[PDB]
CSV table of C-alpha atoms in Angstrom, one decimal:
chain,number,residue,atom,x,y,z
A,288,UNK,CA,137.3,62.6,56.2
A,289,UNK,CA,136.3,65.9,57.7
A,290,UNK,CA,133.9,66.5,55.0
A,291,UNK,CA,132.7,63.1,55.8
A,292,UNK,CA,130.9,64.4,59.1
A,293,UNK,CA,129.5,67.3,57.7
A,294,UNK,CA,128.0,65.4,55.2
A,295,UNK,CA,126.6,63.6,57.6
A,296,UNK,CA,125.4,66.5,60.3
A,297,UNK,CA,123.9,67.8,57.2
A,298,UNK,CA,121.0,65.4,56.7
A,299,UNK,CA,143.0,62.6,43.8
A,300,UNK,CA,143.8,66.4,44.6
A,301,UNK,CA,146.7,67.4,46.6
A,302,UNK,CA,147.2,71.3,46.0
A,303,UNK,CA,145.9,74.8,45.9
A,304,UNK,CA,146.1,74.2,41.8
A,305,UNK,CA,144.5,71.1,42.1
A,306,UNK,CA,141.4,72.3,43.9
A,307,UNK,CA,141.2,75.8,41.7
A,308,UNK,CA,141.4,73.4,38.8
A,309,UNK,CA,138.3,71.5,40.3
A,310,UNK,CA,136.5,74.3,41.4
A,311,UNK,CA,136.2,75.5,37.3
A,312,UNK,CA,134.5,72.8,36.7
A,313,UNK,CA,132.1,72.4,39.4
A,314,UNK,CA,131.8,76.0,41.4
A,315,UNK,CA,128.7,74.7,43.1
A,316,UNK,CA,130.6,71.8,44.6
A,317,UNK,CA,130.5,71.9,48.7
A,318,UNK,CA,132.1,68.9,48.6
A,319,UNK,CA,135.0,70.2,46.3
A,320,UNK,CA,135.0,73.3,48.5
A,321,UNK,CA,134.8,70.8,51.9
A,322,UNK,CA,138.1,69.1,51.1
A,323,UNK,CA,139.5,72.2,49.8
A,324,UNK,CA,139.0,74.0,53.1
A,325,UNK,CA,140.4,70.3,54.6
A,326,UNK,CA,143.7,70.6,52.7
A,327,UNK,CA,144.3,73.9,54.2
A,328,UNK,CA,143.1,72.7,57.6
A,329,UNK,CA,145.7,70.0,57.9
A,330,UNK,CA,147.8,72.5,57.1
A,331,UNK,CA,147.1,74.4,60.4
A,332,UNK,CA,146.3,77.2,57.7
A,333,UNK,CA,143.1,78.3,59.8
A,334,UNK,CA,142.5,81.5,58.3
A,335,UNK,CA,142.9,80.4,54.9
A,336,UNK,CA,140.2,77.7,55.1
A,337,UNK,CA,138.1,80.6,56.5
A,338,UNK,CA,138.8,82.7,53.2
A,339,UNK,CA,137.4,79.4,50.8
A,340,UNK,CA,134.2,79.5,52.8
A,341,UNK,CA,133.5,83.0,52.3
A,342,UNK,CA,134.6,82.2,48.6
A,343,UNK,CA,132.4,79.0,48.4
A,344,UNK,CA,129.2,81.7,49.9
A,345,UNK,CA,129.9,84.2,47.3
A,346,UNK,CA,130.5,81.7,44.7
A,347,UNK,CA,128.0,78.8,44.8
A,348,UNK,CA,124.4,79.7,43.0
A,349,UNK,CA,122.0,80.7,45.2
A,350,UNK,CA,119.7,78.0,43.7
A,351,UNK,CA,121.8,75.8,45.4
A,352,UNK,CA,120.5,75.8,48.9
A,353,UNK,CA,121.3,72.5,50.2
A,354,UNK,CA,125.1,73.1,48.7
A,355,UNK,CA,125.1,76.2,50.6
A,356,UNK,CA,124.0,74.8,53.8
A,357,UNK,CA,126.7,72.2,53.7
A,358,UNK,CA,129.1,75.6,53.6
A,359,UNK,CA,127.9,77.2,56.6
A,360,UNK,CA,127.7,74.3,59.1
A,361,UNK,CA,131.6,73.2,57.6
A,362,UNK,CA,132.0,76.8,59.2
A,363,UNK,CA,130.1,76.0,62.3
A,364,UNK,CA,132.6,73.5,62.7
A,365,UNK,CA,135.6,75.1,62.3
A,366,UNK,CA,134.8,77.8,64.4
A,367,UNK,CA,134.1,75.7,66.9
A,368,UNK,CA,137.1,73.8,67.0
A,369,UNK,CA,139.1,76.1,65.7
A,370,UNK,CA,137.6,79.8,66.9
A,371,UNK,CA,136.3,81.0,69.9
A,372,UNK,CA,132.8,82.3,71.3
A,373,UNK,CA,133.2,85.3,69.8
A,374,UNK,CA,134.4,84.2,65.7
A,375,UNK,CA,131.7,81.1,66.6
A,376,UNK,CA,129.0,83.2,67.5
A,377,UNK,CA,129.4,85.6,64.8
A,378,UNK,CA,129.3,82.9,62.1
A,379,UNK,CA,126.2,82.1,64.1
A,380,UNK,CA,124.2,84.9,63.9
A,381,UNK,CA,125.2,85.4,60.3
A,382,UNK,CA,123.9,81.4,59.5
A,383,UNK,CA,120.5,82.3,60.9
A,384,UNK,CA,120.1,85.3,59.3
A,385,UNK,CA,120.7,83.7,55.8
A,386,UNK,CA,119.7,79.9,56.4
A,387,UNK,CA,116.8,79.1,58.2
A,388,UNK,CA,117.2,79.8,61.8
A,389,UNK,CA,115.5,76.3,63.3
A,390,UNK,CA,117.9,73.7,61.2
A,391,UNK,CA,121.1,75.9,61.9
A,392,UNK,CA,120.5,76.0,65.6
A,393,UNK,CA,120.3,72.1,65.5
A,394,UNK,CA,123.6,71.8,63.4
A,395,UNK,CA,124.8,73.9,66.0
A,396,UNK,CA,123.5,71.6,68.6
A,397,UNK,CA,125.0,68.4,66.6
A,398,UNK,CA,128.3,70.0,66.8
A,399,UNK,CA,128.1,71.0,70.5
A,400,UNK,CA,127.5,67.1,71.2
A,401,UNK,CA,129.7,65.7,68.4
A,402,UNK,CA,132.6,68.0,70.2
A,403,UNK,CA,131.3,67.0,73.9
A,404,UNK,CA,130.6,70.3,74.7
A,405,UNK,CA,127.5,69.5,76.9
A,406,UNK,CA,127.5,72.8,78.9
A,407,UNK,CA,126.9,74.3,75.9
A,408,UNK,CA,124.5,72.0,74.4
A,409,UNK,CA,122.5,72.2,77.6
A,410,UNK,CA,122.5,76.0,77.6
A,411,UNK,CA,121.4,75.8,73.7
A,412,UNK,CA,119.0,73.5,73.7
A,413,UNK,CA,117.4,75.8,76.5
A,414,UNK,CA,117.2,78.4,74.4
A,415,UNK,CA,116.6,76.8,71.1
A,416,UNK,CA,113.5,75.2,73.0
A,417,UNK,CA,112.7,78.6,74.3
A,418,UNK,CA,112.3,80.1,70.9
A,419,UNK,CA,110.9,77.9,68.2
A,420,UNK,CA,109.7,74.9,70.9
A,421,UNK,CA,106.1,76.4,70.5
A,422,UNK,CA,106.2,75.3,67.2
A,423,UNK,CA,108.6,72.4,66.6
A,424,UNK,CA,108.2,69.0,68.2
A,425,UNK,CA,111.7,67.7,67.5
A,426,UNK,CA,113.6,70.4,69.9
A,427,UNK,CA,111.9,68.5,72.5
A,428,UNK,CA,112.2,64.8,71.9
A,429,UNK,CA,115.9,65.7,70.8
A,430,UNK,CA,116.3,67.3,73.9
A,431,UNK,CA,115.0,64.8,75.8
A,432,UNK,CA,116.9,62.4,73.9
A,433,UNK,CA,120.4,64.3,75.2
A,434,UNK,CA,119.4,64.7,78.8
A,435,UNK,CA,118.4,60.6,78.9
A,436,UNK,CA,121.7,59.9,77.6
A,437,UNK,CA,123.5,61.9,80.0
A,438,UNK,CA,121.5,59.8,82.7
A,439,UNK,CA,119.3,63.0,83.2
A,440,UNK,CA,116.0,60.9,82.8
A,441,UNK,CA,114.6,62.8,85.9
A,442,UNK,CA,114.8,66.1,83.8
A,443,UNK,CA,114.0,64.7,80.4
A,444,UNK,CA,110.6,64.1,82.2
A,445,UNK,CA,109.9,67.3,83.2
A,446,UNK,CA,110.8,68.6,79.6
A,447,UNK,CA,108.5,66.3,78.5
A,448,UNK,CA,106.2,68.2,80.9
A,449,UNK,CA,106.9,71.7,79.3
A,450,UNK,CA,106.5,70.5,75.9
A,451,UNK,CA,103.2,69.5,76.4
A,452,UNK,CA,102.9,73.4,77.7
A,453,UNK,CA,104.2,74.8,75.0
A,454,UNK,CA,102.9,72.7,72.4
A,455,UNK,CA,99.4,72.7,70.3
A,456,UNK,CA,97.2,69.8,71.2
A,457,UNK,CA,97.3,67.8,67.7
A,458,UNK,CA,101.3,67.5,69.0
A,459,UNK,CA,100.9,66.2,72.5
A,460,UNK,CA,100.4,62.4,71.3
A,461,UNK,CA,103.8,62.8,69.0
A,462,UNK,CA,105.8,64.1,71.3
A,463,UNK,CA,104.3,61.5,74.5
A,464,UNK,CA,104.8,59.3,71.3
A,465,UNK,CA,108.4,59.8,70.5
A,466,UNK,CA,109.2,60.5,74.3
A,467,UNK,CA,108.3,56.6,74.6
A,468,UNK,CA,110.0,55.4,71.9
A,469,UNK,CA,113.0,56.3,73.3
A,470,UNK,CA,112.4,55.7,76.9
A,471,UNK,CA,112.5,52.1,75.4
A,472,UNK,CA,115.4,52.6,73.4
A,473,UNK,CA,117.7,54.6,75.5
A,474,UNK,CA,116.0,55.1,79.6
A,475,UNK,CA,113.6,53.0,80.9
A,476,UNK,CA,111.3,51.1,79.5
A,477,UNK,CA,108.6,51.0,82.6
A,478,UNK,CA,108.3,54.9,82.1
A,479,UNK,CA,108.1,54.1,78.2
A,480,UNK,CA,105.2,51.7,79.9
A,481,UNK,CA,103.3,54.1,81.6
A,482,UNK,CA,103.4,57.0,78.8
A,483,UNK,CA,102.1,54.9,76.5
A,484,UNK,CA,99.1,53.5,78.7
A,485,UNK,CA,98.5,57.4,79.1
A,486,UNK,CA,98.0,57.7,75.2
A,487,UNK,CA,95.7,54.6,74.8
A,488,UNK,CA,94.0,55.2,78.0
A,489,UNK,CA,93.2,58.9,76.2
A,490,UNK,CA,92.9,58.0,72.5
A,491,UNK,CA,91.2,53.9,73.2
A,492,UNK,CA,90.0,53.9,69.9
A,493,UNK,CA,93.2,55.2,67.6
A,494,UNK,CA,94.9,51.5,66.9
A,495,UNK,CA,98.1,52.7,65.2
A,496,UNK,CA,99.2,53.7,68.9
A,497,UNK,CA,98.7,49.8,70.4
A,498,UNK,CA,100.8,49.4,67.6
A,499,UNK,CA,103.8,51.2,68.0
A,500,UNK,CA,103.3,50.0,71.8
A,501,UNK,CA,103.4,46.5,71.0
A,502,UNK,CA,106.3,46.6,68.6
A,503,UNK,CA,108.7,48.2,71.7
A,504,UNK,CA,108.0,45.6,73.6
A,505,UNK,CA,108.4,43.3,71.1
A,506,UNK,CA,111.5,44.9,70.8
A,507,UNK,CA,111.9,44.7,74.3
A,508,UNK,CA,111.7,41.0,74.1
A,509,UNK,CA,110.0,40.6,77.8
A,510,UNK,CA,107.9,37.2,77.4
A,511,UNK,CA,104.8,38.1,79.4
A,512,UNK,CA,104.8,41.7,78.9
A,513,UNK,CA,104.4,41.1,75.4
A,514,UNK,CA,101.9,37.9,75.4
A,515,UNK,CA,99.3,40.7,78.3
A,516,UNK,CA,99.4,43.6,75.6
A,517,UNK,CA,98.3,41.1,72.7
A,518,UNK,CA,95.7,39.7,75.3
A,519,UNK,CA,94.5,43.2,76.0
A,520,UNK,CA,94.7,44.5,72.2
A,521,UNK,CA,91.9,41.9,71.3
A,522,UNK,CA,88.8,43.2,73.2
A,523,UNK,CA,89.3,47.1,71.9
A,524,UNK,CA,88.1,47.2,68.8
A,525,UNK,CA,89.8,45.9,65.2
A,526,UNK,CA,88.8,45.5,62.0
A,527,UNK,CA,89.3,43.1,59.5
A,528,UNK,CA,92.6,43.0,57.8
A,529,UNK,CA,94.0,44.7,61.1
A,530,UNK,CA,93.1,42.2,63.6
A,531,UNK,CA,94.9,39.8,60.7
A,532,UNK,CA,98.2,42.2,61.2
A,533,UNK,CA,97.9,41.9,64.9
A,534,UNK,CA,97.7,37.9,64.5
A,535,UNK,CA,101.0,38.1,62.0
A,536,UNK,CA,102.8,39.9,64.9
A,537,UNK,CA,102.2,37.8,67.8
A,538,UNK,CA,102.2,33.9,65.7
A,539,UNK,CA,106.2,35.1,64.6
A,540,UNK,CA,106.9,36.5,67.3
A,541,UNK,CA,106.3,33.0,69.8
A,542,UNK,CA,107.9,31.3,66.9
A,543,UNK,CA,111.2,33.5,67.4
A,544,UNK,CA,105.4,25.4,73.2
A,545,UNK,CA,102.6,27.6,73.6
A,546,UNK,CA,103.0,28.5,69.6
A,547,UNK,CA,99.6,26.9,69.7
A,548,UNK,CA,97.5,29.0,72.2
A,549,UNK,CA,97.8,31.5,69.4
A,550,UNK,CA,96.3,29.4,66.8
A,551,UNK,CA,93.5,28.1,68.6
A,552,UNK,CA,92.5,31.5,69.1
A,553,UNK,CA,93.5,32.8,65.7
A,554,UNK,CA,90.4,31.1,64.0
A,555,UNK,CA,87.9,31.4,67.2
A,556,UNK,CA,87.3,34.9,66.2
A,557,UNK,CA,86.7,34.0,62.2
A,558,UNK,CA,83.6,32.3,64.1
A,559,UNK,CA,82.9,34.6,66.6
């Protein structure tokens, strides 16, 4: 059960003999180790279930990277329910110094929100951003993602603004990109509007972005939102096969009256 979150942040035997037994036959087992340190967690046995991670560090193969990771954030997690700043941060410093530094800061992070410890998520993702945001895209959008969910769409924006600052050029339309997305998904949908008339207003040409417009508001569901953007994707440019896609999209979309307007226009452009 507690094994069942960290198996998912990371993307029967009932006693200490039991789980030694186990562990002979599968030493590089997180999971085995996981429920092992459970066992002795429901047993308010806190410092024991520190000892089987430091065994499961010194015991799984060093091959086994992924098996290891699952180790360390199982002891991000129990220091931070369980420690304090101090045992937390240790096990902190030591995780980036032997897994890479990036993926255990957002574990960290993960916890911080999974535990609704916001202050400290803020704080992190600050400083997260602050150190590997010149590099990384997804720092951003996944803080912007927190601060629209905490009704902080305000600052989201002008994260979205350093991001762009901090970022390469080849990045800015993937963040902008992903910033949208969830604007539609999460904040508001007429700022998800205006970023993406931004992108298409600066790349007119690079169809895959009218796109992933079109399908959030399909998404969206607004009638004549939807029916202006298909109007307007027409007279930019399409190939072939892609002005077919576009077709596809709108024709089962207005079947989901004026199902015809579509198809007397579907074949006007066959001819001209």
């Amino acid at each position: 059960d507690w094994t069942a979150s960290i198996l998912d942040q990371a993307q029967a035997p009932e006693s200490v003999a039991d789980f030694e037994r186990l562990l002979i036959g599968n030493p590089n087992s997180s999971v085995v180790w996981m429920n092992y340190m459970a066992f002795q967690l429901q047993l308010s046995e806190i410092e024991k279930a520190r000892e089987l991670a430091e065994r499961a560090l010194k015991t799984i193969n060093f091959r086994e990277e992924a098996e290891k990771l699952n180790i360390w954030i199982a002891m991000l997690n129990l220091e931070n329910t369980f420690g304090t700043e101090e045992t937390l941060e240790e096990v902190f410093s030591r995780a980036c110094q032997y897994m890479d530094s990036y993926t255990i800061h957002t574990k960290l992070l993960g916890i911080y929100e999974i535990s609704e410890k916001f202050d400290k998520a803020a704080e992190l993702f600050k400083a997260t951003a602050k150190k590997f945001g010149g590099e990384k895209v997804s720092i951003w959008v996944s803080w912007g993602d927190f601060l629209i969910s905490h009704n902080e769409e305000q600052e989201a924006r002008t994260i979205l603004g350093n991001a762009l600052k901090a970022l390469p050029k080849r990045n800015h339309i993937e963040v902008v990109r992903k910033f949208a997305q969830l604007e539609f998904a999460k904040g508001d949908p007429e700022r998800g509007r205006s970023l993406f008339e931004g992108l298409v207003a600066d790349a007119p040409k690079r169809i895959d972005l009218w796109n992933v417009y079109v399908d959030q508001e399909v998404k969206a569901k607004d009638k004549k939102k939807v029916e202006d953007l298909f109007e307007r994707i027409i007279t930019k440019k399409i190939t072939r096969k892609q002005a077919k896609f576009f077709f596809n999209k709108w024709l089962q979309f207005e079947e989901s009256k004026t199902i015809e307007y579509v198809k007397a226009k579907a074949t006007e452009y066959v001819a001209s």
